Amino acid sequence: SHPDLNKLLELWPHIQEYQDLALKHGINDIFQDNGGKLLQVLLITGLTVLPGGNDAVDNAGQEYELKSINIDLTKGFSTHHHMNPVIIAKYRQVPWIFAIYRGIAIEAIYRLEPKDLEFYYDKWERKWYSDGHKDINNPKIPVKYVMEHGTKIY
Amino acid sequence: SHPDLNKLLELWPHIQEYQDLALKHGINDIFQDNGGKLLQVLLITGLTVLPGGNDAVDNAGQEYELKSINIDLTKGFSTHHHMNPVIIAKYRQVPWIFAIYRGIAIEAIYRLEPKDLEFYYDKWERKWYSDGHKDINNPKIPVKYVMEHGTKIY
């Protein structure tokens, strides 16, 4: 009924192709849980997403953390909802990949090394002790930090 | 270059065009709450989604309930997790649109009129009293019932 149906039919073969390319990479559904966004980070980066420890691994076995924001909607990257020195002990070991989307398109990707995040890890750990051993619910990493301190891979 | 990264570059034109289309119809992000699936139903059917109540409306102001099924994963449409006689009363007023997907593609759409579903509203309202005012967790309408009782739009 919407004449936009012509358009849909025109478009549809290419949406299915884009979804075949996501299946190839471990994403079952492009239209659910930002699946079609994530495929753009995996294809530019060459990463492979890991199932539900870290989130991605490259060809050489290096694991990474992978955090995303839509910059229209927000300016800080989330980390973990209940962090403590043991989450930080895990976080201390790997580089982090930070993907910035604007809408459905990736706008930029940054890589930060553990040395670039010791700032917040020391601070968070201190704060878990000074607040009497209570878990910090999702501290955030400002976009300006990651853009000051990282390597722009895209 | 990169073989898959060539495909992103070749396909992304058409993904952006499909998202622009979805904005025209009130879906903000095709990759998030099955928004790329729901757009298919709204261009075929010509309906307009509502917020919060029933799911959609035609130009004449008739309202519809709208239910979907991935035919690869299940064989019954869900209803409402807390089924009770007041929910049923809202339900009896509107036609339901059932859309059947295989994966991310729409395969079929049926419309049932309240008379076509009175069968179930009865059984459900009676059960509520008989099992002592106890709400029903999400009763299911069998796909066979809808292929047999409703009109096939698509």
Swiss-Prot record, chains A, B:
Locate the residues binding Mg(2+) 1: 55, 65
What Gene Ontology terms for biological process does this UniProt record contain? DNA restriction-modification system
Q: Which GO terms describe its molecular function?
A: DNA binding; metal ion binding; type II site-specific deoxyribonuclease activity
For this protein, the Enzyme Commission number is 3.1.21.4
> Which InterPro entries does the entry mention?
PvuII_sf, Restrct_endonuc-II-like, Restrct_endonuc_II_PvuII
Q: Which Pfam families does UniProt cross-reference here? A: Endonuc-PvuII (PF09225)
Identify which cofactors the protein needs according to its UniProt entry.
Mg(2+)
Q: How is the cofactor bound?
A: Binds 2 magnesium ions per subunit.
Q: Which domain of life is it from?
A: Bacteria
Q: How does it assemble?
A: Homodimer.
Q: What is this protein called?
A: Type II restriction enzyme PvuII
Q: Which organism is it from?
A: Proteus hauseri
Give the gene that encodes this protein. Answer: pvuIIR
